[PDB]
Amino acid sequence: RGSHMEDFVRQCFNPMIVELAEKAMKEYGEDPKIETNKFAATCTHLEVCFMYSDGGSKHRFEIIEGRDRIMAWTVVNSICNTTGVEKPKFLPDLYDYKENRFIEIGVTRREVHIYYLEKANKIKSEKTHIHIFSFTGEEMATKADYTLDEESRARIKTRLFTIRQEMASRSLWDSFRQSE
Ligand SMILES: O=C(NCCc1ccncc1)c1[nH]c(Cc2ccccc2C(F)(F)F)nc(=O)c1O
Ligand SMILES: [Mn+2]
Ligand SMILES: [Mn+2]
């Protein structure tokens, strides 16, 4: 109670994104007032997912992140029973109707190579596409098929660096980076 991180989070991100992040953390037994770096992280991942689905065509993506566990798994079951895609063991973030595959979006404060290595080991199922962004401006996608336009990806990286600058100007960036 009283953290600068919580107030900055609720100020820097959009009210719907803050509400969704709060519902998610509470759904997973996590306190946004005590685990405030993770509050920021959930909000950032949520905004990156929304931006990512805003790129590309109109009907292209199905958003999985942001829903509650049960409804997200229901939509996943529908996607699988519709397209015949292998049911992912763990919840992805998006589904691409154009490339016909699930998408796992990563946002890390560490080296992108490491984070993708970790997430690729965790998923193991070599069917789901994996796309990592970084707060330094780096990105890395499975097969190096980055799915979206260059402009749409550049927008996301710019937003990430803006978040990083806003945290640094308030002296919460060191803690955020070392928290991962
Ligand atoms: O989907 C995700 N979580 C789904 C479950 C969940 C959602 C929101 N709140 C709590 C639970 C997800 N989580 C992360 C960060 C992370 C990584 C490993 C374990 C736990 C977490 C965290 F912080 F979320 F608990 N990075 C991603 O890229 C990503 O997709
Ligand atoms: Mn997710
Ligand atoms: Mn993700």
The three-state secondary structure class of 104 is strand
The DSSP output letter for 143 is G
Convert 55-66 to b/e letters by CB count within 10 Å (16 or more is b): bbeeebbbebbb
- Helices 4-12 and 36-54, interaxial angle, to 10°? 10
> CA dist 62 to 97, 161, 165, Å?
8, 26, 31
Give the span between the Cα atoms of 12 and 16, in whole angstroms: 12
Residue 139, beta-bridge partner list: 133
- Residues taking part in catalysis: 65, 93, 119
Cα(151) to centroid(ligand 2), Å: 23
- Extended beta strands in 33-100, E state: 61-63, 94-96
Structure tokens at 104: 């796992």
Could you tell me the two tokens for 177? Answer: 């980076």
Q: In testing the pocket of ligand 1, which one of 20, 22, 25, 28 has its CB within 8 Å of the most ligand atoms?
A: 28
Q: How far is the CA of 143 from the centre of ligand 1 (A)?
A: 23
As for ligand 1, residues whose beta carbon falls within 6 Å of it are 24-25, 28, 38, 41-42, 45, 65, 91, 93, 105-106
Helix (H) or strand (E) holding 132: strand 129-134
CB 60 within 8 Å of CB 98: yes
CA angle 59, 61, 64 (to 5 degrees): 135
Instruction: Please report where in the chains the tokens 């992805």 appear, as a residue.
Output: 92
DSSP 8-state class, residue 121:
H
The domain ranges of the chain are 1-180
Please state the atom number of ligand 1 nearest to the C-alpha of residue 91.
Answer: 1
Distance CA 171, CA 166 (A): 9
Taking the C-alpha atoms of residue 153 and residue 142, their distance in angstroms, rounded to an integer, is 15
